[model samples]
Target: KVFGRCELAAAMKRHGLDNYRGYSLGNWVCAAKFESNFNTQATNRNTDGSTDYGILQINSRWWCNDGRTPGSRNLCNIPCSALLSSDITASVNCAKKIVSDGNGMNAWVAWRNRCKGTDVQAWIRGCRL
Candidate 1:
């Protein structure tokens, strides 16, 4: 399930990401754009020998349990496979937990490299708060 820009924001907001932990909808939307290009089933393997999963590319090391990563913390207490579903509800929940756990949006290198501290208005363009 690939999301359009406003559709992504709507889905994320429906799951409670708006202004979560001081991060705005654009921060979430923008991170989604870069991390997974709005694709629900996206996955990327990191150079550090761990994989990232879902739209936010939540990492396998410290967040979700991939069931194969030895020593995974599973801090979000979810199977990493949960992140690949089109529903995105679990993915959003995990992302929120990641933020509350103190990593915030900075957990995403994509967000930090591109969206962080920038004028992200373009990311939220037509979406209403």
Candidate 2:
């Protein structure tokens, strides 16, 4: 599903996240675009063919140990060890959850701090997820 400005704002609101310090919806959209072309159904190619899954493209292998299939699970369980509680709505929340590090928004903040002024390709180097 494609998200516009309003959707991004609402998603950020649900997560109690701020739209500043270079970690705004713009930044997230950029990162998500880089990650999965903003495609919820996107899957990455794997040498063994099991591939990663979902919008954030979390590897199914990394999250599929319980025997439940990706297609049968909800967002939280589909990604298994999700970035946030399953109650969170919207793909932005999921993306944020995946991008966030242990120390709050350390991953997002660090990424912004490192590459806020850089070009897209160079800036991508700073993203943790």
Candidate 3:
């Protein structure tokens, strides 16, 4: 629902995530684009009975509780619905915590398969940070 990629980048920058945990903004942007098409409310049911939540597509198995899943780690301590907000403050914070846990961007499979080891410069192209 955001206007464009630049808007998402700007919001991310404002959230203090331009270059966080050694990963560049471009990497984050690329992952977001692939994971959710920048849609905050995006959700996908996995074959494993887990669901991916929000723009980052955080997995319910370890990241948040969707109520349907029992004994979810809920590491972020926030409902998975929070990740659906356009605000992205809570989502960004949770993502940072996930990275801080030493997983880096690998926590997001999209980042690993698409953004990682690829030329991601275009992700931030023409964006005024």
Candidate 4:
């Protein structure tokens, strides 16, 4: 599923990405927009033989088992294919683990380059409580 701004916000909020670990809705929404343009099926292969999966772009190197990433730690204990589903529940859950793993939102390069310290309020302005 390719999500619009508000549709993506609603999903992120439903999965508790809003203000999870001090990272606001804008943080998740913005980073995801840049990461995969909110496409649930997005996939990008890295030079290290790892792959980024889904909207959150969870990396197969450390988070998911893709059978292609050599010695994948699979920290999220899920197959990389799982993250590609239209249902974002799994993607969001693994994202929390990534944040809770102490990397915070900085785990995503998109967040660091695009969302960090920026006025992301507009990312969520279209849909709010």
Candidate 5:
């Protein structure tokens, strides 16, 4: 479960983990759990019948649009392979940025509010970090 500094730092910046004051780790964690169950290697069929891979469920096709193949090991600009490159921080940060512009962290909030009914924070806390 160890993560690289680049990814971790990106996540900390996106989710306010670097400064937890009034920040809700619960919201972010809940989003992650619902999205990929925290499984870095998780991959599934997306709504469009395309492949979504990694913890953030990035669409393999979209991610691999450029010369990079969906399942190849090369480092694309987004570095899809980095999603599992032992740099979990990078992966988390990538998800956060895609979820939220740079503020509000509204993506997680929307996910919890829409999917989980009550005790959303509690549910998030119960999941692995």
Candidate 6:
């Protein structure tokens, strides 16, 4: 829902994600940019019958449930709909929990395939923080 990357960076830092799980703010910003273009209402369907939810694109298979999907681990203990709001607190916490649970940003295929080895500086270009 934010208009630009700096807004995202500010929100992430305000939410205490500047240095989450040893990954820099750029790491998160880059991942988010590629994941959903920072759009909180984003969602994607996986080939494995699971749906990804929110800006983080968290999967229903291991994260939240969309009611249409089953076998959700629901580890975050929140509804999939909660992640679709402009308010990203639930999504951020769930993402942080995923990193803490050993995925380390690898949970997102976008980050691994698109952001992992690329120059991510542009994701935070001109941001004061």
lDDT scores in order: 0.88, 0.45, 0.88, 0.91, 0.50, 0.85
TM-score of 6: 0.92
Sort order, lDDT high to low = 4, 1, 3, 6, 5, 2
The residue pairs that clash in candidate 3, if any, are none
**Candidate 6 pairs with clashing backbones:** none
Off by over 4 Å in 4: none
Evaluated with lDDT, which candidate comes out highest? 4
Task: Report the Cα lDDT for candidate 2.
Answer: 0.45
Worst 10 residues of 4 by lDDT: 120-129
RMSD values, in order shown: 1.3, 8.5, 1.1, 0.9, 6.9, 1.3
TM-score of 4: 0.96
Work out the TM-score per prediction. Answer: 0.93, 0.44, 0.95, 0.96, 0.53, 0.92
Question: Distance (Å) between predicted and true CA of 66, model 4?
Answer: 0.9
Task: List, in order, the clash count of every candidate structure.
Answer: 0, 0, 0, 0, 3, 0
Question: Best candidate, TM-score-wise?
Answer: 4
Kindly list the per-residue Cα lDDT of model 3 for residues 1-129, writing each as its tens digit. 543798888888899887899888889899899999999999999987888888889888888988887666899998999999978998899999988887799988889999999988788899999
* Candidate 5 Cα misplacement greater than 4 A, ranges: 1-23, 47-49, 60-76, 102-117, 124-129
Tens digit of per-residue lDDT, candidate 1, span 27-75: 9999999999999899999887789999999999989888777776898
Model 2 clash pairs? none
Q: Rank the candidates by TM-score, best first.
A: 4, 3, 1, 6, 5, 2
Which is the winner by TM-score between candidate 3 and candidate 4? 4
**Cα TM-score of candidate 2:** 0.44
lDDT of 4 at 88: 96
